[PDB]
Curated annotation (Swiss-Prot):
Induction: Induced in leaves treated with abscisic acid (ABA). Urea hydrolase involved in recycling metabolically derived urea generated internally or externally. Is able to impair growth of the phytopathogenic fungus Penicillium herguei, and shows entomotoxic activity by inhibiting diuresis in Malpighian tubules isolated from Rhodnius prolixus. In the C-terminal section; belongs to the metallo-dependent hydrolases superfamily. Urease alpha subunit family. It comes from the Eukaryota. Canatoxin, a urease isoform derived from Canavalia ensiformis seeds, shows insecticidal activity against different insect species. Its toxicity relies on an internal 10 kDa peptide (pepcanatox), released by hydrolysis of canatoxin by cathepsins in the digestive system of susceptible insects. In laboratory feeding experiments is 100% effective against larvae of Dysdercus peruvianus and Spodoptera frugiperda. Carboxylation allows a single lysine to coordinate two nickel ions. Expressed in flower buds and young developing seeds. This is Urease 2. Homohexamer. Other oligomeric forms may exist depending on pH and presence of salts.
Length: 90
């Protein structure tokens, strides 16, 4: 049901375009979906949760939530308190 030349031919007995929908098959054999997990959200990045999880970053003593102690389970160690030197000279 796309074009039709003779404005009846797709009904005369049992015709539609070439076969059924359009040509024969282009509806199967690949999908995106979650039939058993109705709670997946967007693609998990389990070695790179650095933009979504409560892990990583100074949530510790200078953050805005009141928890203290490491971060969650010690993922990131240190990087945002003091450390040592860096990109500052004369």
């Amino acid at each position: 049901v796309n074009e039709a030349n003779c404005k009846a031919a797709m009904e005369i007995v049992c015709r539609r375009e070439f076969g059924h929908k359009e040509e024969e098959d282009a509806s199967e054999g690949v999908t995106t979906g979650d039939p058993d997990c109705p709670f997946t959200k967007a693609i998990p990045r389990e070695e790179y949760a650095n933009k979504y999880g409560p892990t990583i970053g100074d949530k510790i003593r200078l953050g805005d939530t009141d928890l203290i102690a490491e971060i969650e389970k010690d993922f990131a160690l240190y990087g945002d308190e003091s450390v040592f030197g860096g990109g500052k000279v004369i």
